[PDB]
């Protein structure tokens, strides 16, 4: 932080990609319900017996 560099070197600032999400022209419907576990971005969600938002996982009896 404190000292600047006088020497000669190199580096990459990084890379960027687009993440496209939509694929068609349907109407969009949204809602906010309270979650029951941690959910990542764009993860498929289910609803448990308590009405929360558990992220989707089949084979659950």
């Amino acid at each position: 932080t404190s000292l600047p560099n006088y020497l000669a070197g190199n580096g990459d600032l990084g890379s960027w990609e687009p993440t496209q999400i939509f694929a068609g022209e349907a109407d969009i419907v949204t809602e906010g319900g309270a979650a029951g576990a941690d959910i990542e971005i764009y993860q498929v969600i289910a609803k448990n017996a308590a009405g929360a938002m558990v992220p989707h996982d089949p084979t659950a009896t």
Binding site: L13, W16, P18, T19, Q20, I21, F22, A23
Partner: protein, 51 residues
């Protein structure tokens, strides 16, 4: 042409016709969606730091 002895009448030669062909063009339709996600991050001809 057919050889024919000059007493007899001669001989009829057959013919032929032709054919037709028809076609139809195919159809091409691409598109793109434009999110805010394809807009908001920086494009290359923009200075670093600010925008």
């Amino acid at each position: 042409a057919p050889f024919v002895a000059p007493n007899v009448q001669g001989r009829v030669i057959k013919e032929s016709g032709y054919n037709t062909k028809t076609f139809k063009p195919a159809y091409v339709k691409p598109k793109h969606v434009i999110d805010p996600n394809m807009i908001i991050p920086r494009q290359p001809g923009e200075a670093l730091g600010t925008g």
